[PDB]
Amino acid sequence: LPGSITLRSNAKLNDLFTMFNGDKVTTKDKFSCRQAEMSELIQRYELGTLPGRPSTLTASFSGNTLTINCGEAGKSISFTVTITYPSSGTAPYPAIIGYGGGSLPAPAGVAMINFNNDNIAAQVNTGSRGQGKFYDLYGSSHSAGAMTAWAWGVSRVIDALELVPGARIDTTKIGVTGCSRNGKGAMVAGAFEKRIVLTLPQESGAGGSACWRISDYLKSQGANIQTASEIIGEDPWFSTTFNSYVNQVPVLPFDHHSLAALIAPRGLFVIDNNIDWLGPQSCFGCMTAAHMAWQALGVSDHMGYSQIGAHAHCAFPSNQQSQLTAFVQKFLLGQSTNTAIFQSDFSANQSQWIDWTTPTLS
């Protein structure tokens, strides 16, 4: 991808199957390139640069705590995660890395890893910019926004689990989850860390499952919905660069359907809810487009979406329990449960937001 490119406005959701330069994506290999391109673009304009594995990484396990040590260019940091094990299952256990513990019921036979994303990158308010262990290592002025920093952290947790089998976690069966602000984070983690087999963003709304374009449209129609321009003023989740496009979203060579598509063909189950601020119709329209990535790869049932009525924020509803379990069993436990789950009480509005077709990738 050229270092210098000229952005152009696109009112609708960007075509997932056409490279930025216009080349058509017709093969699975080509889509892999397209994904790398979308990740590159997303990092450049919205989330900031994602660092690779640090030069120094060591770990140790004691009690139920995993300690991770990272070093890079003379700098070094240390952080920990706590682990809870299931009453059922066989060790090494598959596990879900939960931001702040997440807000989902602990799955049967699945271990829970409590990831304190705040310590990796603070999210108290705008003043948290550049504060956190990630920055203590890469620098206060690193372009990475908090969500990218968090994702980097998750990757380090996985590296550590690979180094310490004594933690008794199956590194080939790791998922990620988070609710509300941590949901946006979980989405980014699944997108940036390919080792994650199941991504469970819970009620992530703006910055997560919602598309910037659809939320803006809804706002202009009078909806009390969170949008890009308003969200960047609450915390440093996105790169500072993003503040330059927040009020001109159409020029972005992507949207969150692109972000979600980075997870394909891996497991993804979006757990949503009807709360106006989240923008449920924007999330559904957005994810409907994202789903086309899996449809193209011939694995439609690897991505699910569910919004059923309304309920208290982050209080996981019983009417979604069987759906979550289906995805957990398939991706974390290796079962073949049915995962054809894609519903919302809102209209996707595909004719309005999607003007591209979905190819059968070779």
Curated annotation (Swiss-Prot):
Optimum pH is 5.5. Induction: Induced in the presence of lactose or sophorose. Keywords: Disulfide bond, Glycoprotein, Hydrolase, Lignin degradation, Pyrrolidone carboxylic acid, Secreted, Serine esterase, Signal. The chain holds residues 99 to 460 of 460 of the full protein. Its EC number is 3.1.1.117. Coiled coil: none annotated. Belongs to the carbohydrate esterase 15 (CE15) family. Substrate binds at residues 184, 226, 234, 277. This is 4-O-methyl-glucuronoyl methylesterase. Optimum temperature is 40-60 degrees Celsius. Its main location: secreted. The gene is cip2.
